[PDB]
Ligand SMILES: Nc1nc2c(ncn2[C@@H]2O[C@H](COP(=O)(O)OP(=O)(O)NP(=O)(O)O)[C@@H](O)[C@H]2O)c(=O)[nH]1
Ligand SMILES: [Ca+2]
Ligand SMILES: [Mg+2]
Ligand SMILES: [Mg+2]
């Protein structure tokens with residue numbers, strides 16, 4: 296079966312772990328335990344194809360920015376996550392996409408822009424603003440909530456479908 300190497304990146308606290316754990320383990324992590332670097336692996340059927348998702352849940356704490364080059368090298372596709380109630384996390388996306396872009400020496404790396412926490416009402420990043428960013432990258436924008444499960448499968452499966460276009 297086909298393996299897909301996914302990597303989840305974004306600022307601290309945007310919900311990278313919560314999203315990954317919701318996808319893989321089907322529950323919502325309420326508490327906030329900052330991540331160093333964890334791996335998750337799960338066999339799933341996507342569009343009729345049995346495949347193995349290998350997902351690297353990375354650190355948003357800038358203290359660990361040194362580890363980015365390593366995982367950006369190995370990853371096949373990147374879930375670039377910000378929170379819709381965290382304007383700064385949205386502005387931070389560019390610096391993640393720039394690094395991925397450099398490391399893969401490519402303007403063409405399978406990526407999905409994800410606006411997480413869409414269950415919360417304190418929105419400061421409007422859908423249209425994120426759509427414009429994703430458009431400029433030539434990638435999809437998808438809103439998610441790790442809490443309600445909204446968009447969670449859509450985000451990760453879309454990332455698989457982007458890798459397949461590569
Ligand atoms: N309401 C709501 N809270 C969320 C959502 N996703 C994450 N959170 C909350 O936000 C906090 C941080 O989540 P977490 O997944 O740990 O973020 P992270 O991006 O993995 N952090 P780090 O970069 O430090 O590893 C937690 O309290 C978590 O419950 C979401 O979709 N909705
Ligand atoms: Ca819980
Ligand atoms: Mg985390
Ligand atoms: Mg505004």
Ligand SMILES: [Mg+2]
Nearest residue numbers: 433434435460
């Ligand atoms: Mg496309």
